[PDB]
Amino acid sequence: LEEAPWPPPEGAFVGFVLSRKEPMWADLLALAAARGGRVHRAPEPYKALRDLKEARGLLAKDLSVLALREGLGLPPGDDPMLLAYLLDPSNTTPEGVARRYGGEWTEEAGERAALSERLFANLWGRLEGEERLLWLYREVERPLSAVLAHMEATGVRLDVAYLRALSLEVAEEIARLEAEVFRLAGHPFNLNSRDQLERVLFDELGLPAIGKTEKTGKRSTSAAVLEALREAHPIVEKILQYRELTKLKSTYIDPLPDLIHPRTGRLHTRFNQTATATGRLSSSDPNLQNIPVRTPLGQRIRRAFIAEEGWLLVALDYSQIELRVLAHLSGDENLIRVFQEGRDIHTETASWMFGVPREAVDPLMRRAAKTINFGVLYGMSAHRLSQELAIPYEEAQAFIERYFQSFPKVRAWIEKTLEEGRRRGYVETLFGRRRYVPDLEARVKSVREAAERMAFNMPVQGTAADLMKLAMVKLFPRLEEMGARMLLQVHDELVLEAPKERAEAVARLAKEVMEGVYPLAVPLEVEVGIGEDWLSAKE
DNA sequence: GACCACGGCGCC
DNA sequence: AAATGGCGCCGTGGTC
Ligand SMILES: Nc1ncnc2c1ncn2[C@H]1C[C@H](O)[C@@H](COP(=O)(O)OP(=O)(O)OP(=O)(O)O)O1
Ligand SMILES: [Mg+2]
Ligand SMILES: [Mg+2]
What we know:
Its EC number is 2.7.7.7. This protein is an alpha+beta fold.
């Protein structure tokens, strides 16, 4: 390519090099652009950023986030990663995509721009003819990247002092727990070392081993195993408490306060757009899609996530989303009738499990009930269900008998999906998002059956993802008009920030947009709450 | 210091 | 642990 002076012409493809992968924290080391047989290299990349109308290229969103960090409205445009990802969601990295579609991902901006230009050419050609993938790119993925860029740049406010205070409290309780364990062991050891724990539990103490680990064949010390051993010895219960507290301290309480951005004073995640096999987003650096919610300590952590002064959080969460999708994809009339007649399957299982009427079902019971229902749906063994519910095989068999008898045409949809996947090599969502599942014809039953479970899950999970993404696309411009913000997505939930004065309006509008995103044979239903913190906003 | 595999576990 | 699926992050034990 001819080296042309900087500034590029409109529509040029950008390439850029960051000191590190997180656009909110990175130094923009270099910036280049490519169009029509030329390459343009910025002498000063931060100043050169002002000349662009849009970020068009590989990882366009990341550059746009960094532009917003520096107060510039540079929205993301075409990204060959999004094209590769729609063709095959195993196309998740630029290293991989380049090798596949005609180049090499280097560390140099010029080359990254030229790569971006020619990869877009090649991948656009492959998507021609592929009209439904094309609709997804134009109407969902491409615009969603702009919405995510704004979410990432905005961040969420965290009560830092609270979390630091909470750390000292939890440290003390941890000391109490580890001291009891060592007493019960007759000696100290590193309780964070599962190998050392294995020896204590199974060699030194008498305790029976329940299972083995996958790769290396060690006697497992997992929560599942420890739960089964909970009466065998009093040490076990302390180990479970120790595990709870150290997980949350080490993953949430300690790291989060140190990730406050100095300019914003807020916490900034990355919403990864080409990371999953089903079309979901992921969140990383810090993952804010797995903030605790079950246990009392987890809930205390969730309270740290707060509204800006004089604003409120609005949390919107789809009700029984994948079940409703399943009713639509399958056409099971009994299951459609459940949702038209306004019944709640998670509470019905909860009342069954704990043996109490629906009026008396609490948060924990209902949560527990969700594992059971998605566990069973996506293929849990009788054996395993008998374990978690703590009942016999006969009983756990009989649960999974009725579950699927209730809803005849689910199994029929499962089989049609499996057959189509075997024939074409891929399965798809309601909108034609694909996942290639090659092992449906494997000769090893276990490999074949795992592949089957992945294959029938994807249309369901991915359709919910498609819906939520489309909902985000539609909702974002409406929020800007109202002076509200989209903060977080947690798969089937959204968290928004609204000025106090407008929070009720925002909530009503966001709920309608989410319920009417794309009507189905069953109604989509959204639960909404408003509060000063994340926990209160779904209380 | 970086990275790796693993077992383990937080959320949907 | 186990015939649920989809993620990312932590500490250990270990390499380079
Ligand atoms: N344990 C699980 N196994 C498989 N899929 C799950 C599991 N938990 C959650 N999911 C998937 C299926 C859910 O429909 C989807 C959204 O999560 P979630 O909001 O917690 O449940 P839900 O939408 O079905 O019930 P709720 O009415 O409480 O919102 O994520
Ligand atoms: Mg939900
Ligand atoms: Mg949810």
